[PDB]
């Protein structure tokens, strides 16, 4: 993968399992175009979103559907989503990991960029 | 001020001054109606977005735009568009503080909800 | 108050009330001398730890103890001992705010340094 | 590994490479006893700190030497360390990952516990 998402749950101290993730890419008309989506695995990871050939230079939006996650567990959270926007491949091809840490009233997101 | 926004820069341990903030409210037809807007002061806060008379039950979006903040540091390239969507006053009136913590590859946001 | 502590609970999106805070200052012999202590108020803040006359250049430790906070929620088991160590006023006097964000398996802390 | 540490740099959007990590275990006399230490790899990970047989029930302290890290890069940070305290194996044997996100004025730490 050049693009991985990883989601952690701060309440339970576990990976967030089975969370919906939607990735969008900013188009020429200046809207968000759907790019990929998936659900996190037992380990809280989502691999296989794209190929290197399909993950070109651009602006991407990762949208994690955290409200459904917290409601599945009986908790009414604050946010609808955890979002993060990043700019890809301005200097060509790279591994990208979007790490997200969730709690009912707070979250953080991080983009890690690695040249293998 | 039942609604307040505070923005901080985690590299420089400073308030983020002149961050544009826009707030929207979901209408009956499911479009986003404009609700309030402002800039963060010297202490990174924005108060006076609304009154309790106008801040009714609903679904609200707060968008922060950090462009002016970065530009004036002489960091033109990186800047942030961040958004939270939440449900307000569903169990009666509350004071909301939306706090955001910025960094070049990471973003955190937290919400503090009290009852006076 | 050139030194302030703010504690927030990220599960409940609330201030943490009655958190004991202790502050220490490194002495000439490299032992930690007691400097100040207090409890967080209703809004999760502690002010009045010191004056600018007493808050001189030095290396300071701030310890937060969340036991009373958890106990009163009926969460006895989990509680936190957290500590930050930092250098204060090295380039002249500054106001410091040490903010902490608690959760069962995660902890965040941030420092905001301004110059009045 | 039943114990891994993972450190990320929020400024550069990379793993934190070559950071010193010290792990302590709380002893019977109620002091911190040294348990293990190591440096993060190219990927920001430290594996091999212990065996399952040696990582028994107890209270552990992970101390990341972040000040040296930031100074290596030319930045005068706020904190001396990123710390985290956790309780291990109260319910027997588990994989533990201590994830840390660093910036010069803020950090977060998370303990992830997984039953393989
Ligand atoms: Cu959605
Ligand atoms: Cu309408
Ligand atoms: Cu813009
Ligand atoms: Cu002395
Ligand atoms: Cu204690
Ligand atoms: Cu050390």
Author numbering:
A (entry chain A), B (entry chain B), C (entry chain B), D (entry chain A): 10 to 125
The paper states:
Soaking TTR crystals with CuCl2 or FeCl2 at acidic pH induces a change in conformation comparable to that observed for the TTR-rhenium complex. Indeed, acidic pH and elevated CuCl2 concentration in the crystal soaking experiments favors a change in the TTR conformation in the stretch of residues 72–92. When TTR crystals grown or soaked in 30 mM CuCl2 the conformation of the TTR-Cu complex yields a distance Asp-38–Asp-38 of 25.0 Å, a Thr-123–Gly-83 distance of 25.7 Å and a Leu-110–Leu-110 asymmetry, which are comparable in magnitude but opposite to that of the TTR-Mn complex. Even if both His-88 and His-90 are involved in Cu and Zn chelation, the interaction from the third residue is different, being Asp-74 for Cu2+ and Glu-92 in the case of Zn2+ at pH 4.628. To conclude, the TTR-Cu conformation provides an alternative starting point for the design of molecules that aim to stabilize a form of TTR with an enhanced Aβ-scavenging activity to counter the reduction of TTR expression in AD patients.
